[PDB]
Write a protein that binds this DNA or RNA. Sequence first.
DNA 1: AGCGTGGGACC
DNA 2: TGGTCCCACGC
Length: 85
Amino acid sequence: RPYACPVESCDRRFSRSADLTRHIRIHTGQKPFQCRICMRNFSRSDHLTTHIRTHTGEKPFACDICGRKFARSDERKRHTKIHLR
DNA sequence: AGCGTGGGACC
DNA sequence: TGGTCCCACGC
Ligand SMILES: [Zn+2]
Ligand SMILES: [Zn+2]
Ligand SMILES: [Zn+2]
């Protein structure tokens, strides 16, 4: 919690100094990761990785119940719960 | 659905 | 630093 965002208009606080560094990019608008397929810029390398799958169609996450594939684990997570009742 | 994207964590 | 998951939330 000791790490406050220096931007004046912003008052968000962070427990980890590094979580502030990432956060600073929201204010600086820095997007240092580019998709070589569509040239779009992204603020995070991990977000670029999952974005690229929208081009290749790579879906490494399969639902345990029906086997349906998803590009992201969170999409699979959101899906799996539909099998309930 | 499709998928951007920030915060927390872990390495 | 900086890479990479999970999470969550949003549209
Ligand atoms: Zn801030
Ligand atoms: Zn792209
Ligand atoms: Zn399923």
